[PDB]
Design a protein around this ligand. Sequence first.
Ligand SMILES: *[C@@H]1O[C@H](CO)[C@@H](O[C@@H]2O[C@H](CO)[C@@H](O[C@@H]3O[C@H](CO[C@H]4O[C@H](CO[C@H]5O[C@H](CO)[C@@H](O)[C@H](O)[C@@H]5O)[C@@H](O)[C@H](O[C@H]5O[C@H](CO)[C@@H](O)[C@H](O)[C@@H]5O)[C@@H]4O)[C@@H](O)[C@H](O[C@H]4O[C@H](CO)[C@@H](O)[C@H](O)[C@@H]4O)[C@@H]3O)[C@H](O)[C@H]2NC(C)=O)[C@H](O)[C@H]1NC(C)=O
Ligand SMILES: *[C@@H]1O[C@H](CO)[C@@H](O[C@@H]2O[C@H](CO)[C@@H](O[C@@H]3O[C@H](CO[C@H]4O[C@H](CO)[C@@H](O)[C@H](O)[C@@H]4O)[C@@H](O)[C@H](O[C@H]4O[C@H](CO)[C@@H](O)[C@H](O)[C@@H]4O)[C@@H]3O)[C@H](O)[C@H]2NC(C)=O)[C@H](O)[C@H]1NC(C)=O
Ligand code: HEM
Ligand SMILES: [Mg+2]
Length: 335
Amino acid sequence: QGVDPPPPPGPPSFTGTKLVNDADHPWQPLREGDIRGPCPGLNTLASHGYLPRDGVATPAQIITATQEGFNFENNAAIVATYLGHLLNGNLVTDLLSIGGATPKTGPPPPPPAHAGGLNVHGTFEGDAGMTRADEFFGDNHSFNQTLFDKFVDFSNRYGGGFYNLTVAGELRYSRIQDSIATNPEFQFKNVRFITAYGETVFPINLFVDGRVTTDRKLSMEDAASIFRDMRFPDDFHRSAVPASNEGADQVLAAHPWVPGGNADNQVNNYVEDPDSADFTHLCRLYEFVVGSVQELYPNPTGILRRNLIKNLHYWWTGVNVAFGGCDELFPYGQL
Ligand SMILES: *[C@@H]1O[C@H](CO)[C@@H](O[C@@H]2O[C@H](CO)[C@@H](O[C@@H]3O[C@H](CO[C@H]4O[C@H](CO[C@H]5O[C@H](CO)[C@@H](O)[C@H](O)[C@@H]5O)[C@@H](O)[C@H](O[C@H]5O[C@H](CO)[C@@H](O)[C@H](O)[C@@H]5O)[C@@H]4O)[C@@H](O)[C@H](O[C@H]4O[C@H](CO)[C@@H](O)[C@H](O)[C@@H]4O)[C@@H]3O)[C@H](O)[C@H]2NC(C)=O)[C@H](O)[C@H]1NC(C)=O
Ligand SMILES: *[C@@H]1O[C@H](CO)[C@@H](O[C@@H]2O[C@H](CO)[C@@H](O[C@@H]3O[C@H](CO[C@H]4O[C@H](CO)[C@@H](O)[C@H](O)[C@@H]4O)[C@@H](O)[C@H](O[C@H]4O[C@H](CO)[C@@H](O)[C@H](O)[C@@H]4O)[C@@H]3O)[C@H](O)[C@H]2NC(C)=O)[C@H](O)[C@H]1NC(C)=O
Ligand code: HEM
Ligand SMILES: [Mg+2]
């Protein structure tokens, strides 16, 4: 009772700004069974009906929604979506939960695979987020007001009351320090190291109304609306261009940092990891995930094997462009 996975959707026909908070996409409250998770973007899209409102969707639905709702760039959408799906989705039913585990993704895969959703900590979701607390403290998915207060503080201190690139640079480093000091299991390597810098600029490039073209900066009201209430600002117009992680290099430059983590279940004991992916060694990330998938799926056969092969190729198509050329791996051979 499986599905044949379609290739990834391409870019939208129209790539300009438009009203996305419109009559066909109203904010609605959560009903019982509806799933939300650590991504404010996907949360908002589900709560406006760009995604299924229950928070379970196909990879193709996620790509279309991120493009339609926010003008997320096509390749960035492919890289993030199939990463999330390979690690956390059900490859047979072609369904991914944007939060925790649910029967809505269908019959479970064979362990060690889990199809447990974007909430699963360790390989995609990780530490030193802006509005979510590290998993060590007990909840890696819920909005956290204490962290949002720090968001506001840093915006007051560095951005005249608004979130801009200067704020992003300072906040990213401070949050890393918070975790070093307080989380003995703190990890900041591989996937998390790369995705964390991109996440800090998404509020600027995607959450700021697209009619704003000079001095792009996010108000705390708009930040609260998306990060906490999963709601587009009134009359929200998406980015006038497809966009992703522009400026992430500047965030790293403001406080140069190396992948690693706290060693030996001890705080204030951050050790570099020289084998981790970084921004000049991106193909390492590709290989780490192919390997993680091999751990989840040690001996797949049948429809599962087929869908794995397809989804792996789909992910490579995005990664190849985004990382500037990586040799494709074939852990389960070819079709
Ligand atoms: C995110 O948000 C933040 C917040 O909104 C934003 O910050 C702004 O960033 C810009 C720069 O990008 C800031 O503007 C710059 O300010 C520099 C520092 O200003 C001080 O020093 C000036 C130079 O000193 C001379 O004069 C003093 C005596 O006053 C003397 O001791 C020195 O020896 C020296 O001779 C000084 O002129 C300036 O005072 C003026 O401005 C203040 C207000 O800031 C005003 O109260 C004064 O009356 C007076 O008008 C101040 O004391 C400054 O050096 C710098 O100038 C360069 O650039 C301009 C053009 O941009 C050139 O004309 C000039 O020749 C220099 O090359 C520039 O003006 C701005 O102040 C920040 N705003 C805030 C609120 O912090 C970030 O940019 C945002 N980040 C992103 C990524 O967007
Ligand atoms: C919302 O998110 C926040 C931020 O993550 C959560 O709050 C944190 O909760 C943890 C767990 O209780 C706190 O951890 C402890 O912090 C000590 C350091 O405190 C200093 O620094 C912080 C900021 O960096 C200041 O707030 C604080 O006043 C101090 O100046 C550590 O020394 C503690 O270590 C002990 O426990 C660990 C774990 O068992 C051991 O490994 C250590 O050896 C040691 O015994 C500890 O880590 C943390 O301080 C909190 N941070 C903040 C900023 O408040 C919220 O719980 C979360 N939920 C909510 C409330 O919405
Ligand atoms: C394309 C598919 C997407 C996937 C699979 C995805 C997945 C994730 C995951 C798993 C996290 C949590 C990582 C963490 O902080 O621990 C996350 C965080 C985040 N995502 Fe997404 N995301 C996607 C698209 C988007 C889009 C389009 C935006 C913006 C419009 C966005 C904005 C964010 C932001 C800002 C965070 C950080 C939240 C915080 O630190 O408080 N994402 N995403
Ligand atoms: Mg996190």
